[PDB]
């Protein structure tokens, strides 16, 4: 099938306007990584075969010293997400801990595909190969946190319904 994520979000509305979610990196550090790697990330969405590792995510993980030779430091990642939740609604503690558990469980279930993705060779000019672990975790975290948002903390409007639909399958890039 055609990659649904090639369409981009259906509305340019900032997701924070739908729900304020926990984070692992400050927006400024995320934007630096996004600007550097979005170009090739979009190209990789239009390539068949084994999913190609997302460099935007590896950049984010490197900015927080969480990534090392195909592994993510779960202890340090949990500490960072929990830090962001300290002044948030109390519902976020459990939602965050459950989201981390589910994302690491999912990553383990696709270990072989992730490992094969790490071994891919550049398929176009200047493509940088990144290990898929960072994107596997980060994509899952963002989508799960947004979907678990309590209705009392979620903006119930048409544009946020569109973002809920889009982001149930497509990660925050």
Structural account:
The protein has a single domain (1-173), classed as Recoverin, domain 1. 52% of the residues lie in helices and 2% in strands. A two-stranded antiparallel sheet has the order 1-2. The protein is globular, with a radius of gyration of 16 Å. Helix 2 (55-63) crosses helix 6 and helix 4 (92-109) runs antiparallel to helix 6. The chain contains seven helices and two strands, in the order ααββααααα. By secondary structure, the chain is an all-alpha fold. One of its GO terms (cellular component) is extracellular region. One of its GO terms (biological process) is sensory perception of smell. Keywords: Disulfide bond, Glycoprotein, Olfaction, Secreted, Sensory transduction, Transport. Disulfide bonds join 5-170, 18-160, 19-149, 33-59, 55-130, 103-140. Its main location: secreted.
Write the topology of this structure.
Blueprint: H1 27-44, H2 55-63, E1 67-68, E2 71-72, H3 74-85, H4 92-109, H5 111-118, H6 133-147, H7 158-167
Antiparallel strand pairs: 1-2
Helix pairs in contact: 1-2, 2-6, 3-4, 4-6
